[PDB]
CSV table of C-alpha atoms and ligand atoms in Angstrom, one decimal:
chain,number,residue,atom,x,y,z
W,1,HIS,CA,145.8,79.8,206.0
W,2,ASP,CA,144.7,78.9,202.5
W,3,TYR,CA,146.8,79.8,199.6
W,4,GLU,CA,147.4,80.4,195.9
W,5,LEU,CA,150.6,79.9,193.7
W,6,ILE,CA,151.8,79.9,190.1
W,7,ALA,CA,155.1,78.3,188.8
W,8,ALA,CA,154.8,81.0,186.1
W,9,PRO,CA,157.7,80.6,183.3
W,10,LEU,CA,158.8,84.4,184.1
W,11,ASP,CA,161.0,86.4,181.6
W,12,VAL,CA,162.1,89.1,184.1
W,13,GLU,CA,164.8,91.6,183.8
W,14,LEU,CA,167.6,90.1,185.7
W,15,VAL,CA,170.8,91.2,184.3
W,16,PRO,CA,170.3,95.0,184.4
W,17,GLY,CA,168.9,95.7,181.1
W,18,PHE,CA,168.3,92.0,179.5
W,19,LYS,CA,166.3,89.0,179.0
W,20,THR,CA,166.1,85.7,181.4
W,21,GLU,CA,163.9,82.6,180.3
W,22,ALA,CA,163.2,81.6,183.8
W,23,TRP,CA,161.0,79.3,186.0
W,24,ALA,CA,159.9,81.1,189.3
W,25,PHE,CA,157.3,80.0,192.2
W,26,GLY,CA,155.0,83.1,190.8
W,27,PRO,CA,156.8,86.2,191.0
W,28,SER,CA,159.8,88.1,192.7
W,29,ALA,CA,161.9,84.9,192.4
W,30,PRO,CA,163.5,83.6,194.1
W,31,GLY,CA,160.1,82.6,194.8
W,32,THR,CA,157.1,84.4,196.4
W,33,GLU,CA,157.4,84.9,200.5
W,34,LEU,CA,155.2,82.6,202.5
W,35,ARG,CA,154.0,83.9,205.9
W,36,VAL,CA,152.1,81.3,208.0
W,37,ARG,CA,151.3,81.4,211.9
W,38,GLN,CA,153.0,78.6,213.8
W,39,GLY,CA,149.9,75.8,213.1
W,40,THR,CA,147.5,76.0,210.7
W,41,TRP,CA,148.0,73.0,208.5
W,42,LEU,CA,149.1,75.3,205.8
W,43,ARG,CA,146.5,74.7,202.9
W,44,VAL,CA,148.1,75.4,199.2
W,45,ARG,CA,147.5,74.5,195.9
W,46,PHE,CA,150.5,74.3,193.5
W,47,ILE,CA,150.5,75.1,189.9
W,48,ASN,CA,152.3,74.3,186.9
W,49,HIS,CA,152.2,76.6,183.8
W,50,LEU,CA,155.8,75.3,183.0
W,51,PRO,CA,156.5,72.6,180.5
W,52,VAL,CA,157.7,69.7,183.0
W,53,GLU,CA,157.1,67.9,186.2
W,54,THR,CA,158.1,69.4,189.6
W,55,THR,CA,157.3,68.6,193.3
W,56,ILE,CA,157.8,71.2,196.3
W,57,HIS,CA,160.0,70.1,199.1
W,58,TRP,CA,159.5,71.6,202.4
W,59,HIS,CA,163.2,71.9,203.3
W,60,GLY,CA,164.0,71.1,206.8
W,61,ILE,CA,160.3,71.3,207.8
W,62,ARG,CA,158.8,68.2,209.2
W,63,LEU,CA,155.6,67.5,207.6
W,64,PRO,CA,153.4,64.4,207.4
W,65,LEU,CA,156.0,62.2,205.2
W,66,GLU,CA,153.7,62.1,201.9
W,67,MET,CA,153.8,66.0,201.6
W,68,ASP,CA,157.5,66.3,201.6
W,69,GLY,CA,157.7,66.7,197.6
W,70,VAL,CA,159.9,63.6,197.5
W,71,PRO,CA,159.1,60.9,194.9
W,72,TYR,CA,157.2,57.6,195.1
W,73,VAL,CA,156.0,56.3,198.4
W,74,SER,CA,156.1,59.9,200.0
W,75,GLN,CA,154.4,61.7,196.8
W,76,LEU,CA,154.5,60.9,193.3
W,77,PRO,CA,155.8,63.7,190.7
W,78,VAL,CA,153.2,66.4,190.0
W,79,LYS,CA,152.8,67.3,186.2
W,80,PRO,CA,152.2,70.3,183.8
W,81,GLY,CA,148.9,72.1,184.0
W,82,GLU,CA,148.1,70.0,187.1
W,83,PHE,CA,148.0,70.4,191.1
W,84,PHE,CA,148.7,68.7,194.4
W,85,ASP,CA,147.2,69.8,197.5
W,86,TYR,CA,150.0,71.0,199.8
W,87,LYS,CA,148.8,70.6,203.5
W,88,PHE,CA,151.0,70.2,206.7
W,89,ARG,CA,151.5,71.2,210.3
W,90,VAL,CA,154.2,73.7,211.2
W,91,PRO,CA,156.3,72.9,214.1
W,92,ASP,CA,159.7,74.5,213.0
W,93,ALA,CA,159.2,78.1,213.5
W,94,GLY,CA,161.5,80.8,211.8
W,95,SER,CA,162.7,80.7,208.4
W,96,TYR,CA,162.6,77.8,206.2
W,97,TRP,CA,162.2,77.5,202.3
W,98,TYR,CA,160.6,75.6,199.5
W,99,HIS,CA,161.8,74.0,196.2
W,100,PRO,CA,161.6,70.9,194.0
W,101,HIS,CA,163.3,67.3,194.4
W,102,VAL,CA,163.3,66.4,190.9
W,103,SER,CA,166.0,67.2,188.1
W,104,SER,CA,166.9,70.2,190.6
W,105,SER,CA,169.9,71.5,189.2
W,106,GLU,CA,168.0,72.7,186.2
W,107,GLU,CA,164.8,73.6,188.4
W,108,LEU,CA,166.1,75.6,191.2
W,109,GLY,CA,168.8,77.2,188.8
W,110,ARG,CA,166.0,78.6,186.8
W,111,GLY,CA,164.5,80.2,189.8
W,112,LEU,CA,162.6,77.4,191.5
W,113,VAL,CA,163.3,78.1,195.0
W,114,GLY,CA,161.5,80.5,197.6
W,115,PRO,CA,161.4,81.3,201.4
W,116,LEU,CA,159.1,80.2,204.2
W,117,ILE,CA,158.6,82.4,207.3
W,118,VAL,CA,157.1,80.5,210.0
W,119,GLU,CA,155.8,83.1,212.3
W,120,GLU,CA,156.6,82.2,216.0
W,121,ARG,CA,153.4,82.2,217.5
W,122,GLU,CA,155.2,83.9,220.5
W,123,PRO,CA,154.8,87.7,219.7
W,124,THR,CA,158.0,88.5,217.9
W,125,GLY,CA,160.1,90.8,220.2
W,126,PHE,CA,161.4,92.3,216.9
W,127,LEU,CA,159.2,95.2,215.8
W,128,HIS,CA,160.5,95.2,212.4
W,129,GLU,CA,161.9,92.3,210.2
W,130,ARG,CA,163.2,91.9,206.8
W,131,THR,CA,163.8,88.9,204.3
W,132,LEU,CA,167.1,88.7,202.4
W,133,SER,CA,166.8,85.9,199.9
W,134,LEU,CA,170.3,84.8,198.5
W,135,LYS,CA,170.8,82.8,195.1
W,136,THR,CA,173.4,83.2,192.8
W,137,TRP,CA,172.1,82.6,189.3
W,138,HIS,CA,173.6,80.1,186.6
W,139,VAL,CA,173.4,82.9,184.2
W,140,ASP,CA,175.8,84.3,181.3
W,141,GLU,CA,176.5,87.8,180.9
W,142,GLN,CA,173.6,88.3,178.4
W,143,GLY,CA,171.1,87.1,180.9
W,144,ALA,CA,170.9,83.8,178.9
W,145,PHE,CA,171.5,80.7,180.8
W,146,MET,CA,174.9,79.2,181.8
W,147,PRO,CA,174.7,75.5,182.0
W,148,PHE,CA,173.7,73.9,185.3
W,149,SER,CA,175.6,70.9,185.3
W,150,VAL,CA,179.4,71.2,185.0
W,151,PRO,CA,181.5,67.8,185.6
W,152,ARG,CA,184.7,69.1,186.8
W,153,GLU,CA,183.4,72.3,188.8
W,154,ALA,CA,180.5,70.2,190.3
W,155,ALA,CA,182.7,66.9,191.0
W,156,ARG,CA,185.1,69.4,193.2
W,157,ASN,CA,182.8,71.9,195.3
W,158,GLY,CA,179.9,72.5,193.0
W,159,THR,CA,178.7,73.9,189.7
W,160,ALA,CA,179.6,77.8,189.3
W,161,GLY,CA,176.7,80.2,189.9
W,162,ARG,CA,177.6,83.9,188.8
W,163,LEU,CA,175.1,86.7,189.2
W,164,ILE,CA,174.9,88.1,193.1
W,165,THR,CA,171.1,88.1,194.0
W,166,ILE,CA,169.3,88.9,197.1
W,167,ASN,CA,165.7,89.2,196.4
W,168,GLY,CA,166.8,88.5,192.9
W,169,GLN,CA,168.7,92.0,192.9
W,170,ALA,CA,172.4,92.7,192.3
W,171,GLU,CA,173.6,95.3,194.9
W,172,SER,CA,170.6,95.5,197.3
W,173,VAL,CA,169.2,98.7,198.7
W,174,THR,CA,167.2,97.4,201.9
W,175,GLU,CA,166.2,100.5,203.8
W,176,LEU,CA,166.3,100.3,207.8
W,177,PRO,CA,165.8,102.2,210.9
W,178,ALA,CA,167.2,104.9,213.2
W,179,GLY,CA,167.8,103.1,216.3
W,180,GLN,CA,165.8,99.9,216.1
W,181,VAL,CA,166.5,96.3,216.0
W,182,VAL,CA,165.9,94.5,212.7
W,183,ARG,CA,165.3,91.1,212.1
W,184,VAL,CA,167.2,89.6,209.4
W,185,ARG,CA,165.9,86.4,207.6
W,186,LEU,CA,168.9,85.5,205.9
W,187,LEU,CA,168.3,82.5,203.3
W,188,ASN,CA,171.0,80.8,201.4
W,189,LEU,CA,168.9,79.6,198.5
W,190,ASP,CA,171.4,78.7,195.9
W,191,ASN,CA,172.3,75.5,194.2
W,192,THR,CA,176.0,75.2,194.9
W,193,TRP,CA,177.9,78.1,196.5
W,194,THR,CA,178.6,77.8,200.1
W,195,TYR,CA,178.6,81.7,201.1
W,196,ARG,CA,181.6,83.1,203.9
W,197,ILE,CA,179.8,85.9,205.5
W,198,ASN,CA,180.5,89.0,207.7
W,199,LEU,CA,179.8,92.4,208.4
W,200,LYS,CA,182.4,95.3,207.9
W,201,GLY,CA,181.0,98.9,207.8
W,202,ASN,CA,179.7,100.5,211.2
W,203,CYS,CA,177.2,98.6,213.4
W,204,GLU,CA,176.2,96.6,216.2
W,205,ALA,CA,174.8,92.8,215.2
W,206,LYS,CA,173.6,89.7,217.0
W,207,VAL,CA,172.2,86.4,216.1
W,208,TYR,CA,169.3,84.6,217.5
W,209,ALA,CA,168.7,81.2,215.5
W,210,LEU,CA,170.3,79.1,212.7
W,211,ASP,CA,168.6,77.3,210.1
W,212,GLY,CA,165.2,78.5,211.8
W,213,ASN,CA,166.1,76.3,214.7
W,214,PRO,CA,167.0,78.4,217.4
W,215,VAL,CA,169.5,78.9,220.2
W,216,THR,CA,171.1,81.7,222.5
W,217,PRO,CA,172.0,85.3,221.1
W,218,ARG,CA,175.6,84.9,219.9
W,219,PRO,CA,176.8,88.0,217.9
W,220,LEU,CA,179.0,89.5,215.0
W,221,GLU,CA,181.7,87.1,215.0
W,222,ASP,CA,184.1,85.7,212.4
W,223,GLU,CA,182.9,84.7,208.9
W,224,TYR,CA,180.0,82.3,209.4
W,225,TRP,CA,179.8,79.9,206.7
W,226,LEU,CA,176.3,79.5,205.3
W,227,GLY,CA,175.4,76.5,202.9
W,228,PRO,CA,172.6,75.7,200.3
W,229,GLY,CA,169.7,74.7,202.4
W,230,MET,CA,170.7,76.8,205.6
W,231,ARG,CA,169.6,79.9,206.8
W,232,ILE,CA,170.1,82.2,209.6
W,233,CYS,CA,167.4,84.1,211.5
W,234,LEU,CA,169.4,87.0,213.1
W,235,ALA,CA,169.3,90.8,214.2
W,236,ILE,CA,170.7,94.2,213.6
W,237,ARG,CA,171.0,97.1,215.9
W,238,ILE,CA,171.6,99.4,213.1
W,239,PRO,CA,172.9,102.6,214.8
W,240,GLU,CA,171.8,106.1,214.6
W,241,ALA,CA,171.3,106.9,210.6
W,242,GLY,CA,172.9,107.3,207.4
W,243,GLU,CA,175.7,104.4,207.5
W,244,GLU,CA,175.2,102.1,204.5
W,245,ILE,CA,176.7,99.1,206.1
W,246,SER,CA,178.7,96.9,204.1
W,247,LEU,CA,177.3,93.3,204.0
W,248,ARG,CA,180.0,91.1,202.7
W,249,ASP,CA,181.2,87.5,201.7
W,250,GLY,CA,184.6,87.4,203.0
W,251,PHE,CA,185.6,90.7,201.2
W,252,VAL,CA,182.8,90.6,198.6
W,253,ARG,CA,180.3,93.6,198.2
W,254,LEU,CA,177.0,91.4,198.5
W,255,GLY,CA,174.4,93.9,199.7
W,256,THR,CA,173.8,97.4,201.1
W,257,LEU,CA,172.1,98.4,204.1
W,258,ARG,CA,170.9,102.1,204.2
W,259,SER,CA,170.5,103.2,207.4
W,260,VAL,CA,167.5,105.5,207.1
W,261,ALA,CA,165.8,107.8,209.7
W,262,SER,CA,163.0,107.4,212.0
W,263,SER,CA,160.9,109.7,214.5
W,264,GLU,CA,160.9,106.7,217.1
W,265,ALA,CA,162.7,105.3,220.2
W,266,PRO,CA,165.1,102.1,220.2
W,267,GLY,CA,163.8,98.6,220.0
W,268,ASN,CA,166.3,97.0,222.8
W,269,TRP,CA,167.6,93.8,222.7
W,270,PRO,CA,164.8,90.9,222.6
W,271,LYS,CA,165.4,88.0,224.8
W,272,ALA,CA,166.4,84.8,223.1
W,273,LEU,CA,164.3,83.1,220.6
W,274,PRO,CA,162.0,80.3,222.5
W,275,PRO,CA,163.5,77.3,220.8
W,276,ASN,CA,161.6,74.9,218.9
W,277,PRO,CA,160.1,71.7,220.3
W,278,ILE,CA,161.8,69.0,218.5
W,279,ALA,CA,163.2,65.3,218.9
W,280,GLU,CA,164.7,65.8,222.0
W,281,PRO,CA,167.4,62.9,222.2
W,282,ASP,CA,168.6,61.0,225.2
W,283,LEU,CA,172.2,61.0,225.4
W,284,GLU,CA,173.2,57.8,226.9
W,285,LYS,CA,170.6,55.6,225.6
W,286,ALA,CA,171.2,55.8,221.8
W,287,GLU,CA,173.1,53.9,219.4
W,288,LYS,CA,175.3,54.7,216.2
W,289,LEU,CA,176.8,53.5,212.8
W,290,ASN,CA,178.3,56.3,210.0
W,291,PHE,CA,180.1,57.2,206.6
W,292,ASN,CA,179.8,59.8,203.7
W,293,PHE,CA,182.8,60.0,200.9
W,294,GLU,CA,184.7,58.7,197.8
W,295,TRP,CA,185.7,58.7,194.0
W,296,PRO,CA,182.1,54.9,185.8
W,297,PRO,CA,180.0,57.7,184.6
W,298,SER,CA,177.4,59.7,186.9
W,299,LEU,CA,178.5,61.1,190.2
W,300,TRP,CA,181.9,59.0,191.3
W,301,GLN,CA,180.9,60.5,194.7
W,302,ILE,CA,180.3,57.4,196.7
W,303,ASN,CA,178.0,57.1,199.9
W,304,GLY,CA,179.0,54.9,202.7
W,305,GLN,CA,179.6,52.4,199.4
W,306,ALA,CA,176.5,52.5,197.9
W,307,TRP,CA,176.2,53.6,194.4
W,308,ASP,CA,172.7,55.3,194.1
W,309,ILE,CA,171.0,54.5,190.6
W,310,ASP,CA,170.6,50.1,192.5
W,311,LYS,CA,169.0,52.7,194.8
W,312,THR,CA,167.2,54.7,192.2
W,313,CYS,CA,163.8,55.1,193.3
W,314,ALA,CA,162.6,52.2,195.8
W,315,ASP,CA,165.0,51.4,198.2
W,316,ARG,CA,168.0,49.0,198.7
W,317,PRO,CA,167.8,49.7,202.4
W,318,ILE,CA,170.5,52.4,202.7
W,319,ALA,CA,169.8,52.6,206.2
W,320,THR,CA,167.4,50.6,208.5
W,321,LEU,CA,166.1,52.9,211.6
W,322,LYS,CA,163.5,52.3,214.4
W,323,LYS,CA,160.7,54.8,215.6
W,324,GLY,CA,160.8,57.1,218.5
W,325,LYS,CA,164.5,55.7,219.5
W,326,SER,CA,167.2,58.2,220.2
W,327,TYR,CA,170.1,57.8,217.6
W,328,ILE,CA,173.6,59.0,216.7
W,329,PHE,CA,175.9,59.9,213.4
W,330,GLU,CA,179.5,60.1,212.6
W,331,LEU,CA,180.3,61.6,209.5
W,332,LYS,CA,183.6,61.2,207.6
W,333,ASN,CA,184.2,63.9,204.6
W,334,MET,CA,186.5,61.7,202.4
W,335,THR,CA,187.1,63.5,199.1
W,336,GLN,CA,189.3,66.6,199.2
W,337,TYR,CA,186.1,68.8,199.2
W,338,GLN,CA,183.5,70.1,201.7
W,339,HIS,CA,179.6,69.2,201.7
W,340,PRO,CA,176.4,70.6,203.3
W,341,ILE,CA,174.8,67.5,204.6
W,342,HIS,CA,171.1,68.2,204.7
W,343,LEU,CA,168.1,66.5,206.4
W,344,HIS,CA,164.1,65.8,205.8
W,345,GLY,CA,161.2,65.5,207.9
W,346,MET,CA,163.1,65.9,211.1
W,347,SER,CA,166.0,68.4,212.3
W,348,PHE,CA,169.0,67.6,214.3
W,349,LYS,CA,171.2,68.8,217.2
W,350,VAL,CA,174.8,68.6,217.1
W,351,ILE,CA,177.3,67.7,220.0
W,352,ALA,CA,181.2,67.9,219.5
W,353,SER,CA,183.6,67.8,216.7
W,354,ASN,CA,187.0,68.6,215.2
W,355,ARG,CA,187.0,72.1,213.0
W,356,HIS,CA,184.6,74.0,215.1
W,357,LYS,CA,184.5,73.0,219.1
W,358,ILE,CA,181.2,73.0,220.7
W,359,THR,CA,180.1,75.4,223.4
W,360,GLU,CA,176.0,75.4,223.2
W,361,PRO,CA,175.0,72.5,221.0
W,362,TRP,CA,172.6,73.5,218.1
W,363,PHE,CA,169.6,72.4,216.2
W,364,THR,CA,169.3,72.6,212.3
W,365,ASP,CA,168.0,70.7,209.5
W,366,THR,CA,171.4,70.7,207.6
W,367,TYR,CA,175.0,70.1,209.0
W,368,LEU,CA,177.7,71.9,207.0
W,369,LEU,CA,180.4,69.1,206.9
W,370,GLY,CA,184.1,70.4,206.6
W,371,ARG,CA,187.2,68.2,205.1
W,372,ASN,CA,188.4,65.3,207.2
W,373,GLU,CA,185.7,66.8,209.7
W,374,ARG,CA,184.3,64.2,212.0
W,375,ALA,CA,181.2,65.4,213.9
W,376,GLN,CA,178.6,63.8,216.4
W,377,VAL,CA,174.9,64.8,215.1
W,378,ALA,CA,172.1,63.5,217.2
W,379,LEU,CA,168.3,63.1,217.3
W,380,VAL,CA,165.4,60.6,217.4
W,381,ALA,CA,163.3,59.4,214.6
W,382,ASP,CA,160.3,61.8,215.3
W,383,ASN,CA,158.7,61.4,211.9
W,384,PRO,CA,157.9,58.4,210.2
W,385,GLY,CA,158.9,56.1,207.2
W,386,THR,CA,161.5,56.8,204.4
W,387,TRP,CA,162.9,60.3,204.9
W,388,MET,CA,165.4,61.7,202.6
W,389,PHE,CA,168.8,62.9,202.9
W,390,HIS,CA,171.9,64.3,201.2
W,391,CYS,CA,174.8,66.7,200.1
W,392,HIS,CA,172.5,69.7,199.3
W,393,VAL,CA,175.3,71.1,197.1
W,394,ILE,CA,172.3,70.2,194.3
W,395,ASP,CA,175.0,69.0,192.0
W,396,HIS,CA,176.4,66.8,194.4
W,397,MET,CA,173.0,65.5,195.1
W,398,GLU,CA,171.9,65.2,191.5
W,399,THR,CA,173.1,62.0,190.2
W,400,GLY,CA,174.7,60.0,193.0
W,401,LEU,CA,175.6,61.7,196.3
W,402,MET,CA,172.1,61.1,197.9
W,403,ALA,CA,170.7,58.4,200.3
W,404,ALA,CA,168.0,57.6,202.8
W,405,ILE,CA,166.2,56.1,205.8
W,406,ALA,CA,162.9,55.0,207.4
W,407,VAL,CA,161.2,54.4,210.6
J,501,CU,CU1,164.4,69.3,203.1
J,502,CU,CU1,178.6,68.6,198.3
């Protein structure tokens, strides 16, 4: 599977009837959609027609280290009118995404994000799917860009996005079936906003995976909090036709789901997603240390106490890990705010905690850590060397809420 790709500085009509001076991954930004079979070292040549350097981070995604879009011993930072060969095996089925790991506030903020369907090689029980690609843009009322870094907004829960965009569309008109189940690849791809999601309106609705990394089929539920660098592969039995089902964030009119007609029979409930083969950790055998949290210009958002810029580029060994050995992490949120703690490279299972309490443990690349929460996450050092790891509230990362570890 061998592929193209512009980083095209695209003027596109974002604000209905207006400008917008943006940097897309080709067209239809948030990015162009990626489909690969679960296998082929996915061949791609990145392209820059933009004025400055940019990687491509394969979020969650557990590639050969070099490839992870991660500056300096992994890959050094690709330039304007230049390319790097992007090539990697695809282990983690279901929705992942892509986006830089450079000056990212600005970069992603200007549209540098996009999805990554990873076609489960098992014939998807779902007849029909769809992609529902969430960002909310740092744009003023005229389309021109609001700042991406905002100190007192960002030193609390993150810098303010504004415009509500699925596939880059405010008020989405995604058209659907009379009777069939539908796969609902929902991707939070925002910088900063942590989205509090529900369904009102008349329909049946079930989930299958989360953050690509599947599990059993839990349904409709309370408002499931979705974080930056989180996703949710999920299903909807839209009823018999008509109903424009209200997609919401708590109350908030996000998108709309026109139930359109079909001369066709029902695509009744698929049996559970066959979970991803992952760093399956041994329970009693692992060991443990911990941290996150605190509050001198640049982030004052301290990391198990370790500034970050001595840690700028090389490594003051912020953690020291061994290959193939199973392992465990306590996480304390210490500042009066909430952080979506992400990982590359590997993807992890969760065990037990405070805020939510644990029925079936779940795989994901990113854990969504609440205030004073102390959650037991666990995996094994599957992939090698220096992997990156950090508060995916992009701003919280940017200048000093990042840290990392090797194998
Ligand atoms: Cu990542
Ligand atoms: Cu954060």
